């Protein structure tokens, strides 16, 4: 008598959007236990393996316990999706915590990387590979300063094919091992990705960089990088040595995770007391804040455009569904019919209970309430404005966070960087600017930027 996810768990709120789908904060309807549920849509995400292979991996993952690996509790499957139920962590992504600090040293970076290597070492002993390791996959257990790191998504890449949409692969190219690109890879690919992360922690710049995804990959495939940035003069020789060993091109010659744990640099800078020479890496922390702000604004711009395209689709679809449900032809509908069409639109709303409450938030939001006969036209406007909120609000937030000098504007040099990261062709975005403001002087305010994004998604 195979069990059913929504019989045991109720959705509370959305936590985020990650690799392969949405992560939802959920609650056990009996015990009250809160959990983070990754919901994988079978239609959007193709499987690479067979069901037998996926179920065996899940059964193994549930039995593993390590302080630096996200704990998986439960797995469910229905007709339309897969549900992975794990422990919820509230510290956010590591890099977003790092940029809030005013002090950051080699000791802080070694504490960090020792946890990651310790988690990876354990999973490789159990023959599980991550493959897609990156800063976004490093969560902090809690918002405390002393918080442990938890790696998420260990093992999913083997069974599910990653999205080819740019909104989903932002900041993936920097960390992928070169052997992964060419097809023959093993567990050493996780040491490479960790090496890239360490390079960034100590310099604030990716070792392999470029103006678009494909230029970055051309750099990764060649394998060449350097330590001639000025801020490497402040960094121990020991740390550089570990990096060279992790970023070794030929995987059989690259250091193992387990050996990396024993490296002098990890042994020296993780002893809690000895500060033999420990400066603060001020340039690095500010490079990381620039890096992070750039990536967050490009990501928010793509989700803004995506949300605007969805709201065009859903507005028209919902209107045609309501039109056909309107047997009177008077343009009015009752509550149950509004619920029925919104559910028909279906295909965060994990059960019928989720839908009824969204509709109720909109019927409350219909300003003042007359009960029986509701103007389907206005419900559509408000239901959809609701859906875009998180993404327009988030767009402005990310613009303000990128504009660190509070100038109110972003330069065309900055736009080139942002649109390169978002993979929007150069000729295309300038044509668009030229049409928004025929007189501009190489910089745009938030409203102009916003108008550019709308033109770049056909509005
Ligand atoms: C086999 C593992 O299956 C799972 C189960 C739960 C998961 C949960 C998360 C997760 N994802 N998230 C939030 C988003 C994860 C992706 N980031 C880019 C944005 C935040 C979580 N927040 C708190 N706790 C969590 N557990 C998560 C990520 C991957 C998961 C994979």
Author numbering: 42 to 388, 395 to 506
List sentences from the manuscript.
The structure of NcCDPK1 as seen in both the apo and inhibitor-bound crystals is consistent with the “inactive” forms previously seen in calcium-free crystal structures of CDPK1 homologs from C. parvum (ApiDB_CryptoDB:cgd3_920) and T. gondii (TGME49_101440).
This argues for flexibility in the orientation of the piperidine substituents even after binding of these nanomolar inhibitors, and allows additional chemical modifications of this group if necessary to further optimize PK/AMDET properties. This observation supports our inhibitor-binding mode model derived from BKIs-Tg/NcCDPK1-complex crystal structures that shows favorable interaction of the C3 aryl bump with the gatekeeper hydrophobic pocket. Our data shows 1294 had a 2.6 nM IC50 against NcCDPK1 enzyme and 32 nM EC50 against N. caninum tachyzoites. Compound 1294 was recently shown to be a highly selective inhibitor for parasites' CDPKs compared with 80 mammalian kinases presumably due to smaller gatekeeper residues in CDPKs and other interactions in the CDPKs active sites. Pharmacokinetic data with 1294 demonstrates favorable absorption with low clearance, supporting daily oral administration, and low toxicity in mammalian cells and rodents. A therapeutic oral trial with a BKI, 1294, demonstrated marked reduction of N. caninum cerebral parasite burden in mice, thus demonstrating proof-of-concept for neosporosis therapy.
